[model samples]
Target: VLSEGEWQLVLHVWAKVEADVAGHGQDILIRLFKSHPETLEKFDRFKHLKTEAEMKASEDLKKHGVTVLTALGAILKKKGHHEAELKPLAQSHATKHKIPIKYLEFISEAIIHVLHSRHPGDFGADAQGAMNKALELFRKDIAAKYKELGYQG
Candidate 1:
């Protein structure tokens, strides 16, 4: 479980993401697709995107990017451990989406990268550690729910 101090630290960094969730969210997904291009298999509209220009022009990609940041924004607001809020998200990824947990790991790293890069000055040492800790907790919670939902991966 994350402590009070850690939650404060996390929220400090999250303020930046909350400011422009969609734009930074797109950046996170952009990094993910660049590093693991095959991850786009889940998003049919974007899977055929041939280049960064095509991807940048995709309204579909931008919409889903908003969805991601919106979800994370809700999670951070509750300061983690809000299973009521997480269940549907886990169910969607585990069953409706059938996403590989490996891709989720990639997204986690991508989130951290985007957050830190957005404000390298504020996201210095302690904030970086707090963000990692917060996301790890968030990841574990979803993974736990995934297991509960009987997702093999």
Candidate 2:
């Protein structure tokens, strides 16, 4: 759904950010946790780690963060065509973890916030719109899987 210019902006900024994937991922998770503390309850490994420093120090958090960022990186590389990659994850969260869809939406919002803060100049309004559209498609794909599992939430 991205225009050519929007695609360029997303890829270019992603290229710069990918170099520090660990840092970026950690920051995104941290922001998510800070903004919505209840989200931490969904992750058994991270639920007890309340402080930012504690979360940063946990090897599990680092691994999960990297996993999330890596998935996002893949989606960005495929330019929203690889949204199916997230279906299994969505199913697991819905069926096993019982995570509500709103939290997933919050994650998307956190990603946008991080992208804007990380690349203030490169992630402009148009770029934000493109990313939002891509995220909306991704969320829809996830929601479909959740629905197939009869997730009422």
Candidate 3:
């Protein structure tokens, strides 16, 4: 079995992936634009964003930071995990600010690229395990941070 932290990571990653996939090809951009016109002007079309606000937006999506963690809480509900998962994330957002999921993805991609360079292995080996590990680290780090903040959500 996975460790408590690992399970949390799995669930967190799974939820984010699910949310993105569910939202993909939809009017997410439009929704985001409508939600925040400033953010809309800040972001670009036909390409990814690379700004602090954009990064924060990505992180907010990952953890539901903007909506007061409601997006993440909804995902947890869909995933059938305890509502407690929201507490750590909520507190973290309230205190540490958001980390932006897109920025995290950029970091994750960079790590994978470095791993690929060192290993020179096929995608089957280089991509899967390292990517999973990186995501797990993300989950653990977030969870640990939440715990440190005295959150039990």
Candidate 4:
């Protein structure tokens, strides 16, 4: 079980993820759909299948996870703990999910929703591609961070 402080950290992590996605103009609900199309059946409460703001926001949020992970490293540094293994954790998650780097752009737009005020307004293939680029950058940063931390295994 996580300690109180750890739990708080987890909450913060969750918020950070949410914030990132919100900034990028994606919604977690949508990402959940893209990541696992079958899960859509579970969400009967959501309506208005109009704009892609939520979906965009969710993609951005996942993209921002890289920044959050970097910030976490800094935070851990202050606490005398080093999360040198996070890169592998991320890689493992990506590999297990079979998520392509190309598909990561959705995370960036999702994060844009959280950080920016501009509405995603009817996102299509182009919007998705843009978000994918953002996620690509994020993934690159994460990979670099792991290399920096010597997380080769």
Candidate 5:
């Protein structure tokens, strides 16, 4: 559970960042594959893009990135415990996208990296820890769905 202080910091900066969802959304995914190309290889559409410029230039990646960040902000608005919010995306991630669950770990790393870089002052250690915890709950919740659907990875 987030203390009121942690909750405030998470939502506060999220509010600031949501305004540029498209930019930062892409940044998170770009950060992800850039840090680990092996993760990018899983995405059929993105697998062919071998460089940072190629990844950034892909329209499919841009649209998907926006979709991801929008879902994240919506879930955050639910205070990180909305089962309804988790359902469809969870199912989609498991079956439709076949996204490896391990991407959650990579995603969180990229997410923290982006948030910290953007708000070096406000998203300090304390706030970064809270955001990670918040995201932890989300991925676990989503992972539960992965298990429910029998997706081994």
Candidate 6:
């Protein structure tokens, strides 16, 4: 749904964030856990990492963060062609992990927050709106697939 210019903006911003993927991805996961403590229960390995220091030190957390950020990068690269790619992940989260749609939405918010905080000058209102639309599209697509599977949660 993004215009060509908007897509470019997203790519530009994402490039900067991806450059420091380790730090930014870790920050996103940290924020997710801190803001929604219950989310910790989703990961058996990470469930024991109650403290920020522990979460940061977690090898599992680092690996998972990188995986997520890398998947996000692929999504951005494929753009509108991402639905097929994301559907399986959505299905697994819904059927296996029992992840509620709200947490998926939270991931969008967390990414936006990270981008705004990390690059305030570049991530302006226009860029934010574009990213919001992109993330919302992603959310809706995932939600649709999840719902189709009859997963209420």
- Evaluated at residue 140, the lDDT of candidate 4 is 65
Flag regions of model 4 displaced more than 4 Å.
1-26, 31-85, 118-137, 143-153
Q: What's the C-alpha lDDT at position 149 in model 6?
A: 87
Clash pairs for candidate 6: none
Residue 14 CA error for candidate 6 (Å)? 1.0
Model 4 lDDT per residue over 1-153, tens place = 224454344334334443443342234345445565544433333343334555454444445445543454343333322235446655654554434443334444444443233333333344434433434444565556545544454
Over 4 Å off, model 2: none
RMSD of 2: 1.8
Per-residue lDDT of candidate 5, residues 106-132 (tens digit): 988999999999988879888898898
Cα lDDT computed for each candidate against the true fold? 0.83, 0.81, 0.43, 0.43, 0.84, 0.84
Q: State TM-scores per candidate.
A: 0.93, 0.88, 0.27, 0.33, 0.90, 0.93
What's model 2's overall lDDT? 0.81
Candidate 4 lDDT score relative to the true structure = 0.43
Alpha carbon deviation, residue 34, candidate 4 (Å): 7.5
Clashing pairs in 2: none
lDDT of 6 at 16: 88
Q: Which portions of model 6 show Cα errors greater than 4 Å?
A: none
Per-candidate clashes come to 0, 0, 5, 41, 0, 0
Task: By lDDT, rank the candidates, best first.
Answer: 6, 5, 1, 2, 3, 4
In the range 84-146, model 3's lDDT, one tens digit per residue, is 654656465536654444433443444344334433433336244534564555555555555
